[PDB]
């Protein structure tokens, strides 16, 4: 009673919703459930790309230090992505998660110094604040408005211990001198799956508005805003954890009945 | 072939925030596995109203037949069924007794919530499910919910003096909040543990006591594991990302 079209729509959906670090396992599962490699190839190739861009997959480019994020902002069409720091495009294989064919590329000579200044400040912030963080900063004119888009990824994959986690944050500064509108979104996903499946999914929207001046000084100011908000979010998450544990969890079920002993099952039954 | 194994692996990985939709989608992806999936994939418990006795009871695959569910209070299906699976007279008597017993267990440990017990016959004994559902009151703008699903298989012997018990217990724990500091936070999912034991069956140690002790031991253990995993391990993982 279910058509192939419906089955592959479901396959594509599950692939896009794989937890951090578990794309291969989910893909293998879905591949064997569909049992139709052709259907999967046709009806689900968009999903591999959507996963990598949604997840800000960092990727190492042979010849260049550090990594670049795969994001919607880097998507150049035709399987290529932009690396705005190294000023190159490259082919990206969404299935093997492999970059190749780096070629020099042009972007925006106007937003050039601002992007570089923000990138320089952001890279230092990310190396200082994240154990293995990576960032990518783009500079484009959107609806006529000069925009700096800063993307930050950091993950820890430990599948032998049955857990994985990933932080993503994306910060957009729309420059409207003497101010800039800041919009951002911070996201966390954590998955623990030893004898179960527990996940944290969290996200926070940020709206702010700050003074803009020169490129280097504005970059410093932008990084302080990012720092303050990301610290506050991480602090608030740990507070929520404390409250959930000492309030909500405790109210859901006692450790023991008021007698401070386990039940007498014979006295229950009579 | 490997299909069921892959379907269950998927459920361990897809976000439990979409647990109900995940199962519905999986059954559409592999329709021929429907019975096995309904049987093997736990879902949040639903509360229904028994309009005959006026008591709440819990819905899951174990008390379902077609689109109807059997109440442990009135022993009837809703919507009514001509030919719904019913326990034997002997098992129904044990079921009533279990329901009363686990209702006191529920009050003692949960101080609220809803419980239900459903038994069914096996060739050489019987099986049961003990269900508990408790919603938090919503204090400090945190939504909370606990589901216990304890499935026990009892193999009875010709002598009637010993039985083998195997308990497979899932607990699902759901927490959600939306605050200015944290934004939306949803911490949810489930853990499953199993254990197995021969026990004396006697007048001093009857089936309900044997099962009750194992259920209590298991749920106490899972409560402490949940505490460790939710509020210890996931939090440490978060702080390890930044």
């Amino acid at each position: 009673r279910v058509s192939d079209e419906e089955k592959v729509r479901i396959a594509a959906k599950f692939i896009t919703h794989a937890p951090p670090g578990e794309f291969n396992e989910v893909f293998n599962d879905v591949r064997l459930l569909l049992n139709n490699d052709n259907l999967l190839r046709e009806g689900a190739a968009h999903a591999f790309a959507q996963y990598n861009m949604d997840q800000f997959t960092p990727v190492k480019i042979e010849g260049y230090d550090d990594q670049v994020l795969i994001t919607e902002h880097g998507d150049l069409g035709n399987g290529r992505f932009l690396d705005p720091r190294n000023k190159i495009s490259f082919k990206f294989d969404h299935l093997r998660k492999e970059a190749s064919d780096p070629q020099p590329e042009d972007t925006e000579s106007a937003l050039k110094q601002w992007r570089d200044a923000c990138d320089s400040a952001l890279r230092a912030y990310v190396k200082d604040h994240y154990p293995n963080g990576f960032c990518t900063v783009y500079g484009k004119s959107i609806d006529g408005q000069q925009t700096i888009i800063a993307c930050i990824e950091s993950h820890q994959f430990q599948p032998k211990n049955f857990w994985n986690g990933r932080w993503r944050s994306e910060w957009k500064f729309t420059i409207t001198p003497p101010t800039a509108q800041v919009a951002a979104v911070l996201k966390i996903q954590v998955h623990y799956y030893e004898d179960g499946n527990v996940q944290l999914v969290s996200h926070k929207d940020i709206q702010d508005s700050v003074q803009v001046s020169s490129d280097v000084q504005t970059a410093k100011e932008f990084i302080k805003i990012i720092e303050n908000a990301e610290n506050e979010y991480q602090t608030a998450i740990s507070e929520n954890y404390q409250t959930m544990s000492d309030t909500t969890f405790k109210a859901l079920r006692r450790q023991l009945p008021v007698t401070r002993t386990k039940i007498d099952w014979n006295k229950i039954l009579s | 072939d490997q299909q069921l194994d892959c379907a269950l692996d998927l459920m361990r990985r897809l976000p439990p925030q979409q647990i109900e939709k995940n199962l519905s989608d999986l059954i559409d992806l592999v329709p021929s596995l429907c019975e096995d999936l309904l049987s093997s994939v736990d879902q949040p418990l639903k509360i229904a109203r028994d309009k005959v006795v006026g008591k709440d009871y819990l819905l899951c695959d174990y008390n379902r037949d077609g689109d109807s569910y059997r109440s442990p209070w009135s022993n009837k299906y809703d919507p009514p069924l001509e030919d719904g699976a019913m326990p034997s007279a002997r098992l129904r008597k044990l079921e009533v007794e279990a329901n009363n017993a686990f209702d006191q267990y529920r009050d003692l440990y949960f101080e609220g919530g809803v419980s239900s017990v459903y038994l069914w016959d096996l060739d050489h004994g019987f099986a049961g499910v003990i269900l508990i559902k408790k919603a938090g009151d919503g204090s400090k703008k945190i939504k909370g919910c606990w589901d216990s699903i304890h499935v026990v298989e009892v193999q009875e012997k010709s002598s009637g003096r010993t039985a083998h018990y195997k308990l497979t217990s899932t607990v699902m724990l759901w927490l959600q909040t939306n605050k200015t500091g944290s934004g939306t936070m949803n911490l949810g999912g489930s853990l499953t543990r199993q254990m197995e034991k021969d026990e004396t069956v006697s007048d001093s140690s009857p089936h309900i006591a044997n099962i009750g002790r194992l259920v209590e031991d298991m749920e106490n253990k899972i409560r402490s594991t949940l505490n460790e995993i939710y509020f210890g391990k996931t939090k440490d993982i978060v702080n390890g990302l930044r």
Binding site: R1, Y193, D195 | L4, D5, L8, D9, R12, I27, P31, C34, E35, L38, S39, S40, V41, D42, Y62, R64, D65, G66, D67, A85, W120, L122, A127, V151, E153, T168, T170, T192, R193, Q194
Partner: peptide
């Protein structure tokens, strides 16, 4: 290669499927 405890719980055969799935 995950262990699936819920796959080997006792069953009740003879259960009719929900109508939308036929059986």
């Amino acid at each position: 290669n995950l262990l699936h405890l819920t796959a080997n719980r006792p069953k009740m055969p003879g259960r009719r499927l929900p109508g939308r799935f036929n059986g």
